[PDB]
DNA sequence: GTCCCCCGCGTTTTAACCGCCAAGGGGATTACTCCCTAGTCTCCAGGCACGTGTCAGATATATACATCCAGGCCTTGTGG
């Protein structure tokens, strides 16, 4: 699970969280050719390589462009880094992270991976 | 690709088509009677044959505008 190379004030000092087989990297997309949607929500959870610190990452836009993006960071509180990551993950998929390995679609949200 | 006009056909009904009975308008016919234009011969000027030169406008000529083809920015709109 690689450090987005869009992140560039982290992907020099930081790696991917995880825990056992709980990864937090995400890509997810919204692809519709009705409503004319093709655009994507990546979400990464960040560890510094120097300190117990943390940070969200996070970009959008249509496929093969960009859009905006946001780098969260928070203060080594690890519980709101998480809370951020699965808010944001479940607000743009209507499912919850303990519920990535029975993952269901929904319409007018994103899919993932 | 898709919007909808016109093709085909059941039900309703009125005015086109059918019988024949009236009144008289107006086209056809035969008769009246003098007005119209063909026809004669003579006069003469409208109109045509043909000299001749003014002046319209084609032919340049130098010049100023109309408008076609690239070449070149600013505001409103779609999706995020």
Redesign the pocket.
Known sequence: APVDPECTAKVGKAHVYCEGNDVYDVMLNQTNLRD????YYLIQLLEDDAQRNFSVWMR???VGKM??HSLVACSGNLNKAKEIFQKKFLDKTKNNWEDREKFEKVPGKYDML
């Open positions: 004319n949607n093709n655009k959008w836009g249509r859009g905006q």
